């Protein structure tokens, strides 16, 4: 009803858009260990996208009158567009910025 | 699908049984604010008074409120079956009452006074401020006050 596109196209666009491409990880030889930046696999991209979307929808619908379904709809639409209002896109950009800083 | 606009005689917080009862919430759970009146009792008296339970308490008439008050103040007169009552076979007269807003505290207190002056175990317990229903005191009721 909102965003008359195919909603399956909408969700796959959301997944493609909120998939963190670069991420950090502890690498070291012992006491000399740092958080180094690395690529991200596509399967982990998909999984992290789904997790971020669902967690944002959940903690949005929590303790408020809106429903889990319409919160998830908000999340998916804003993620397919690219918003910086969605929990998912915000976390994505945070992680990518951190990995850029820790190259 | 019922939309009647309303006429502005609606009232917010009202007063009865010396309790500032809230409007803007349905009458059953509004009346629950009255100490001595719970969900069952209030639902039952609001059924016996034949007031619509879909109505908000602030949207009601003084005659309805007085009917409800009269019922809860002498409920057995209106075919209430004598086991909904908080004080039945009381302790002195053997009749069945139903205490309300301030009478609940006064009656609890005179019960404790009876037990204390009798030096009963439960009265001594209440006086000392401990648990009386036989619970274990070793791990609970630590910062009880």
């Amino acid at each position: 009803v909102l965003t008359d596109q195919n909603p399956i196209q909408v969700v796959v666009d959301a997944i493609t858009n909120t998939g963190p491409r670069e991420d950090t990880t502890r690498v070291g030889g012992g006491g000399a260990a740092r958080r180094q930046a690395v690529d991200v696999s596509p399967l982990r991209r998909v999984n992290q996208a789904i997790a971020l979307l669902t967690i944002g929808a959940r903690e949005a619908a929590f303790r408020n009158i809106k429903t889990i379904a319409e919160t998830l709809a908000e999340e998916l639409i804003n993620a397919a567009k690219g918003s910086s209002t969605s929990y998912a896109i915000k976390k994505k950009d945070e992680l990518e910025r951190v990995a850029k800083s820790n190259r | 699908s019922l939309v009647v606009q309303e006429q502005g005689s609606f009232q917010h917080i009202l007063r009865l049984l010396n309790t500032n009862v809230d409007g803007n919430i349905k009458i059953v759970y509004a009346l629950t604010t009255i100490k001595g009146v719970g969900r069952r009792y209030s639902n039952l008296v609001c059924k016996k008074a034949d007031v619509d339970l879909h109505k908000r308490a602030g949207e009601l008439t003084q005659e309805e409120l007085e009917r409800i008050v009269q019922i809860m103040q002498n409920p057995t007169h209106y075919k209430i079956p004598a086991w909904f009552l908080n004080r039945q076979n009381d302790i002195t007269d053997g009749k069945d009452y139903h205490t309300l807003a301030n009478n609940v505290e006064s009656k609890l207190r005179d019960d404790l006074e009876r037990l204390k002056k009798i030096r009963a175990h439960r009265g001594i317990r209440h006086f000392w401020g401990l648990r009386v229903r036989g619970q274990h005191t070793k791990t609970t009721g630590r910062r009880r006050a």
């Binding site: 009803v1 909102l2 009158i65 809106k66 | 606009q5 502005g8 609606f10 908000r56 910062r143």
Partner: protein, 82 residues
């Protein structure tokens, strides 16, 4: 007794419980322009309560302003009819 928490209060909205003519004709003129209409919409927009929102949704679908597409309980989904 240390709680290990923050305990930040909120604003405590006061959504309406019963309506009048101003809220009614605001509803009647504003439930169009809404591409998606449900209780959440009729509370984040017009500050009526959820009960009033349920009743108003049934009412408007009676007249025919909002079109239903699925009336599953706990989630009523309406669009605007043109």
């Amino acid at each position: 007794k240390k709680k290990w928490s923050k305990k930040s209060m909120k604003d405590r909205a006061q959504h309406a419980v019963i309506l009048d003519q101003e809220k009614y004709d605001r509803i009647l003129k504003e439930v169009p322009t809404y591409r998606y209409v449900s209780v959440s919409v009729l509370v984040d927009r017009l500050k009526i309560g959820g009960s009033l929102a349920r009743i108003a949704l049934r009412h408007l679908e009676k007249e025919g302003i909002i079109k239903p597409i699925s009336k599953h309980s706990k989630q009523a989904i309406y669009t605007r009819a043109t």
